[PDB]
């Protein structure tokens, strides 16, 4: 809940990325707070 609405943190072998559930967007950059 430390991310903006709709975002979740995903862990993979190389690190953590971010997934925006409503769109399916994924990105390495933190989406903010």
């Amino acid at each position: 809940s430390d991310l903006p609405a709709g975002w979740m943190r995903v862990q993979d072998t190389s690190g953590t990325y971010y997934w925006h559930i409503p769109t399916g967007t994924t990105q390495w950059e933190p989406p903010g707070r």
Binding site: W19, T26, W28
Partner: peptide, 10 residues
Amino acid sequence: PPPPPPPPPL
């Protein structure tokens, strides 16, 4: 079951 989250960018 529901699928894994989408993969990250390359």
